[PDB]
Amino acid sequence: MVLYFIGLGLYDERDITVKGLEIAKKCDYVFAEFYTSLMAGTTLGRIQKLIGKEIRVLSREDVELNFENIVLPLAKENDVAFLTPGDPLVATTHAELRIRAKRAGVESYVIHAPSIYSAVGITGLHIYKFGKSATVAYPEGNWFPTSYYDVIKENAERGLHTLLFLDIKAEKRMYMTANEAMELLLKVEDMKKGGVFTDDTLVVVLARAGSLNPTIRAGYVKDLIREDFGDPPHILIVPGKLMIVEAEYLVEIAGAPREILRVNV
Amino acid sequence: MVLYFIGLGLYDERDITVKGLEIAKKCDYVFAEFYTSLMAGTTLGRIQKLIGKEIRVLSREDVELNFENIVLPLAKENDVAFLTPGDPLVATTHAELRIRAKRAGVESYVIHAPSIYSAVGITGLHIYKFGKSATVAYPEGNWFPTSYYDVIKENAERGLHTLLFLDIKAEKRMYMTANEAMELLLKVEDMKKGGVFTDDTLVVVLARAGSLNPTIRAGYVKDLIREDFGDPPHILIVPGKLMIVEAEYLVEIAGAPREILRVNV
Ligand SMILES: Nc1ncnc2c1ncn2[C@@H]1O[C@H](CSCC[C@H](N)C(=O)O)[C@@H](O)[C@H]1O
Numbered sequence: 392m393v394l395y396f397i398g399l400g401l402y403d404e405r406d407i408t409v410k411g412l413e414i415a416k417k418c419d420y421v422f423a424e425f426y427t428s429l430m431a432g433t434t435l436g437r438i439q440k441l442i443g444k445e446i447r448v449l450s451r452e453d454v455e456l457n458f459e460n461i462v463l464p465l466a467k468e469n470d471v472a473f474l475t476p477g478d479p480l481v482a483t484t485h486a487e488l489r490i491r492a493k494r495a496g497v498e499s500y501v502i503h504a505p506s507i508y509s510a511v512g513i514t515g516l517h518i519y520k521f522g523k524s525a526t527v528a529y530p531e532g533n534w535f536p537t538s539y540y541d542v543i544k545e546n547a548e549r550g551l552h553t554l555l556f557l558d559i560k561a562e563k564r565m566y567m568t569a570n571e572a573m574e575l576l577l578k579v580e581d582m583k584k585g586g587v588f589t590d591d592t593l594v595v596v597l598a599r600a601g602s603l604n605p606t607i608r609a610g611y612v613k614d615l616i617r618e619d620f621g622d623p624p625h626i627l628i629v630p631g632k633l634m635i636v637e638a639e640y641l642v643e644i645a646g647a648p649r650e651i652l653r654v655n656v
Numbered sequence: 657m658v659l660y661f662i663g664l665g666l667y668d669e670r671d672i673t674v675k676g677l678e679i680a681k682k683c684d685y686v687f688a689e690f691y692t693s694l695m696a697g698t699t700l701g702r703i704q705k706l707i708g709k710e711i712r713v714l715s716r717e718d719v720e721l722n723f724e725n726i727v728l729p730l731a732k733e734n735d736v737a738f739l740t741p742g743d744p745l746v747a748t749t750h751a752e753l754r755i756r757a758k759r760a761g762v763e764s765y766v767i768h769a770p771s772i773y774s775a776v777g778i779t780g781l782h783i784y785k786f787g788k789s790a791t792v793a794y795p796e797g798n799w800f801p802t803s804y805y806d807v808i809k810e811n812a813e814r815g816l817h818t819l820l821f822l823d824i825k826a827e828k829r830m831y832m833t834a835n836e837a838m839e840l841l842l843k844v845e846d847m848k849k850g851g852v853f854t855d856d857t858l859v860v861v862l863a864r865a866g867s868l869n870p871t872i873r874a875g876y877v878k879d880l881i882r883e884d885f886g887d888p889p890h891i892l893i894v895p896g897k898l899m900i901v902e903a904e905y906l907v908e909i910a911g912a913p914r915e916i917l918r919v920n921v
């Protein structure tokens with residue numbers, strides 16, 4: 392009669408919370424999805440070893456369309472767990488699954504876990520200064536998305552930082568890199584000429600948040616566009632006007648140019 | 657040799673990640689501060705038991721003035737852990753402590769944990785639609801803080817949601833309730849008369865996130881200002897323009913008035 396939405400955390404199998412692991416252990420059935428994001432710091436096997444249960448993976452369609460024919464039925468007579476990377480209900484569509492539960496007579500509880508939304512705090516930028524978020528999507532065919540460009544403009548216009556998730560083809564295991572993201576934005580700046588993203592724009596790159604050795608780099612596009620940030624996942628951030636304390640962090644912890652202390656404050 | 661910043665989580669001692677626990681367990685000295693947030697589902701005793709180490713708790717002064725005198729010295733000879741509620745670098749000024757660590761020749765590592773900043777997802781509001789954040793501070797003496805009010809206005813103008821952290825006076829054991837935040841906002845509305853916060857405004861209240869049964873309620877200020885949401889911590893949210901699915905979630909899961917279902921696009 393109970394369904395648990397349990398977050399798996401940021402990077403590896405140790406990133407799940409104690410509460411999430413003990414509840415998952417007492418569940419009769421354990422499902423998981425890996426299309427909204429991947430756990431690049433681990434594998435399905437390791438997660439199964441840690442949980443001690445057989446984990447049935449669900450595709451985007453299993454979740455979006457048939458969640459009620461796959462997960463809810465069993466949750467009607469047993470205790471089920473639905474594992475997701477990061478924090479549950481950050482994925483725009485997951486919240487609705489709680490409504491599907493209710494109409495099926497199934498109760499549901501949420502067990503939180505670290506999300507990249509809070510972890511960006513490791514970049515030293517204040518959390519209250521992050522504005523609207525966006526996702527940089529790969530262009531394809533005759534389609535060239537650019538709304539993420541306008542999000543940056545509106546945020547920075549108000550002195551706000553912009554958090555940009557990079558594109559991901561989970562099934563294919565293809566991660567967009569900060570580098571490609573920077574290439575797209577430059578390609579967009581060229582077409583919209585709004586003066587939002589150029590070689591002189593200051594940006595921050597966070598890679599493998601959750602790991603003990605994340606890559607935190609800050610600098611101007613012209614310098615980082617071809618820098619190696621390591622393995623995925625990559626998160627890109629275009630900060631607004633910096634607070635002096637913010638800039639000092641980037642310089643001392645993220646290897647930012649001393650220049651940002653007078654140019655971006 | 658090293659300093660670890662380990663987040664404790666939202667509600668109780670189980671909200672710590674597994675990675676966080678296994679690391680804390682192997683540390684020589686464990687410190688912690690419980691003034692930046694409130695973990696209402698546990699005690700220091702339960703945390704000490706889980707970690708199997710004694711925990712010396714620090715005050716805001718110990719930390720803000722003597723972190724490098726109390727904690728750092730030990731980090732040069734041992735593995736030291738500094739524990740905090742939620743995520744260590746979210747809505748705190750601890751990020752700067754990593755610079756003090758650097759200037760003392762101490763490598764530091766961050767272990768994240770569930771944060772109220774990402775747990776807002778349980779309210780059904782799309783987390784990418786949250787704009788600038790703010791804190792509703794306690795007026796004291798003749799000083800009456802009001803800046804969080806302009807933050808709401810600016811967000812609402814863009815259709816973005818506003819996350820409001822509520823003030824906390826740990827040493828006086830004071831934890832601002834959503835009710836108190838609403839009272840203060842109304843008073844600020846009288847002064848500025850900008851039409852940003854009134855009896856007819858729709859608000860959302862999340863109390864004790866992280867617990868299995870948090871209180872999630874959405875409705876008009878005139879109806880909620882006097883409602884009892886349970887023990888703190890409280891967070892107050894002022895939604896921007898609602899998308900249909902956000903509205904349905906608020907109606908289905910947060911007991912919101914069924915009229916918010918009809919959206920004005
Ligand atoms: N579990 C919880 N439920 C409701 N609100 C909470 C909460 N935890 C913290 N808060 C809100 O957040 C404020 C503290 S700000 C610091 C919180 C911590 N850095 C984190 O990442 O969550 C509290 O005063 C309250 O306004």
Ligand SMILES: [Pt+2]
Pocket residue numbers: 517634635636637
């Ligand atoms: Pt600041």
